[PDB]
Design a protein around this ligand. Structure first.
Ligand SMILES: CC1(C)S[C@H]([C@H](NC(=O)Cc2ccccc2)C(=O)O)N[C@H]1C(=O)O
Ligand SMILES: [K+]
Ligand SMILES: [Zn+2]
Ligand SMILES: [Zn+2]
Length: 240
């Protein structure tokens, strides 16, 4: 319950099985799951759950199929609406480790085409459907049908070459996934698959795609202010 990496539990957190849920807005919750590293401890990872138009939309899986099934069970108990689709934000275990559980539940899955192409090489199951992007970063609309309030944006290579981001129209929330680190972070996390030349511009592009959002949600820290974007970009400036 006390991760080595990731935010600790706080007031407003609901423990459900091995996961933690936090309501961020009337129709938006953050899911948190934990992977125990032998000799190191637990690493927390965050995604989103959105209620729109009688259905639920999921952003990112948990680390494993079992944890992702637990997300679906929490949805059933707390929201009790069908889960129409999930979007996963790049091909690494913290974001895509639970694809099989979504597929077995009948949930349609979407990822950047490049995420689907990298998925097997990264140990992940590909999503069923591929999103593609305009040169300006915005999703090609016919590849993202019935996405409700989700606004999917590819900011450019950064944490990985395939990383995508998601804003929730009608809210104060935008989700940077593993691209954005919090405003007090000391590092950019795992740079092993990263594009250090383009990272800073990609972080700034995320901020400019979602100019209004004041709640920046991210994979390994509690939601932060827009200072997370500026700090991430300035940390990334030093990589060039
Ligand atoms: C430092 C991280 C939190 S590690 C994570 C990701 N690694 C995995 O999902 C695999 C994995 C499997 C078992 C244990 C740990 C990791 C990656 O390589 O980007 N995201 C990084 C980040 O956001 O900076
Ligand atoms: K890799
Ligand atoms: Zn990653
Ligand atoms: Zn991560």
């Amino acid at each position: 319950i006390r991760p080595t990496i990731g935010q600790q539990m706080e007031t407003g957190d609901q423990r459900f099985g091995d996961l933690v849920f936090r309501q961020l807005a009337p129709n938006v919750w953050q899911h948190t799951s934990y992977l125990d590293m032998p000799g190191f401890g637990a690493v927390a990872s965050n995604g989103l759950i959105v209620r729109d138009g009688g259905r639920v939309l999921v952003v990112d899986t948990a680390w494993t199929d079992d944890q992702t099934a637990q997300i679906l069970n929490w949805i059933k108990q707390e929201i009790n609406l069908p889960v129409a689709l999930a979007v996963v934000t790049h091909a690494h275990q913290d974001k895509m480790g639970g694809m099989d559980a979504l597929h077995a539940a009948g949930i349609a899955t979407y990822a950047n085409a490049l995420s689907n192409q990298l998925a097997p090489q990264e140990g992940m199951v590909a999503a069923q459907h591929s999103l593609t992007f305009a040169a300006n970063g915005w999703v090609e609309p016919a590849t993202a049908p019935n996405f409700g309030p989700l606004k999917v944006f590819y900011p450019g290579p950064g944490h990985t070459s395939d990383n995508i981001t998601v804003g929730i129209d009608g809210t104060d929330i935008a989700f940077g996934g593993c691209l954005i680190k919090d405003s007090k972070a000391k590092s950019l996390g795992n740079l092993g698959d990263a594009d250090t030349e383009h990272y800073a511009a990609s972080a700034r592009a995320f901020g400019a795609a979602f100019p209004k959002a004041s709640m920046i949600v991210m994979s390994h820290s509690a939601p932060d202010s827009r200072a997370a974007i500026t700090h991430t970009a300035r940390m990334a400036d030093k990589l060039r």
